[PDB]
Amino acid sequence: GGGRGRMLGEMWKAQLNQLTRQEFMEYRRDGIIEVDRSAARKARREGNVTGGHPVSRGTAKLRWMVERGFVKPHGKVIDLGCGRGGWSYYCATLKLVQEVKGYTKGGPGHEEPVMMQSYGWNLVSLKSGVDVFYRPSEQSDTLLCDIGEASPVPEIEEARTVKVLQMVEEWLSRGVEDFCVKILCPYMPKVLKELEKMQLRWGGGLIRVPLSRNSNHEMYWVSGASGNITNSVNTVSQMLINRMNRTNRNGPKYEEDVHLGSGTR
Ligand SMILES: Nc1ncnc2c1ncn2[C@@H]1O[C@H](C[C@@H](N)CC[C@H](N)C(=O)O)[C@@H](O)[C@H]1O
Question: Is 65 in the pocket of ligand 1 (CB under 6 A)?
Answer without folding.
Answer: no
